[PDB]
Amino acid sequence: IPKEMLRAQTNFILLMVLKQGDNYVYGIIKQVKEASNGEMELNEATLYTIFKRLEKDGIISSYWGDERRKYYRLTEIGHENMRLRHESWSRVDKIIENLEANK
Amino acid sequence: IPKEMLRAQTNFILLMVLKQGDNYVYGIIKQVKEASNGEMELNEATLYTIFKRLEKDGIISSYWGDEGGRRKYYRLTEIGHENMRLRHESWSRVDKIIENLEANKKSEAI
């Protein structure tokens, strides 16, 4: 499994979490650890690296709670990319099914 | 849509095509366009570039076939078939994680 694929899989998971709803880093690590039955356990510094890029590209934004803790939210643009990406990957599944069909 | 994602998708179809059976560049362009009902149009020069990478990594190899004429075909190696299995398994696990994220969510509601 190539390095590019584990990065892509990690990205997909984080963005799906925020689509479930706003959340914070320590909450994101816990939720993921228990949904993989302990298999996937993310590192603080890793999430920070990925969030800097996503916030630079306008995909997510952050704000304060109880104003102590820092929350993250999927932006307007962000929701749009989720839909584009899901659509393209759906069409590919049909194409492959059809390559074998005409076969 | 990121470049790496379209790059990954084209990679994915191409390897699936060879998994259907051996093929050559023009047939690969032909076979895909008719299964996409004309929608998808692959570039020759890209395929030339993309097939070099896969052969460098031991994923595909080629041999000579007779058309009449004489054509060059491409074939998926063992290493290729094993990566196909690995790739499918990992992405199955990712789908499970997503399945459980929404369940534990609905469980907190109650």
Residue numbers in the entry:
A (entry chain B): 4 to 70, 75 to 110
B (entry chain A): 4 to 70, 73 to 115
Published text:
In doing so, we enabled the formation of iminium ion intermediates formed by the condensation of aldehydes with the amino moiety of the pAF catalytic residue, thus mimicking known reactivities of small molecule organocatalysts in a protein scaffold. Assessment of the Michaelis–Menten kinetic parameters of these evolved mutants revealed that the mutations that improved one catalytic activity caused a concomitant decrease in the other, i.e., directed evolution produced catalytic specialization. We successfully obtained crystals for both the RGN and RMH mutants, with one crystal diffracting to a maximum resolution of 2.45 Å for the former mutant and two crystals diffracting at 2.55 and 2.24 Å for the latter.
However, RMH has new side chains installed proximal to the pAF residue. While in both crystal structures, the mutated M19 and H93 residues are close to the reactive amino moiety of the pAF residue, the R92 side chain conformer varies significantly. We used DFT to locate transition states and intermediates for a reaction pathway where H93 acts as a general-acid residue to promote hemiaminal formation and dehydration. With the participation of both H93 and R92 (i.e., the front-facing conformer), the reaction proceeds preferentially via the (S)-configured hemiaminal, with the highest overall barrier for this reaction sequence being the hemiaminal formation 15.2 kcal/mol above the lowest energy substrate conformer, and the dehydration step proceeding with a barrier of 8.7 kcal/mol. Noncovalent interaction (NCI) analysis on the transition state structures was also conducted for both the forward- and backward-facing R92 conformations in the (S)-configured pathway to identify which NCIs may explain the role of R92 in lowering the transition-state energy.44 This analysis identified a hydrogen-bonding interaction between R92 and the hemiaminal-oxo moiety in the forward-facing conformation, which is not present in the backward-facing pathway. Our previous MD studies of the RMH-variant substrate-free resting state demonstrated that the motion of the two R92 side chains in each monomer is sensitive to mutations, with the cis-forward conformation (i.e., both R92 and R92’ facing toward the respective pAF15 residues) being greatly diminished in improved mutants.
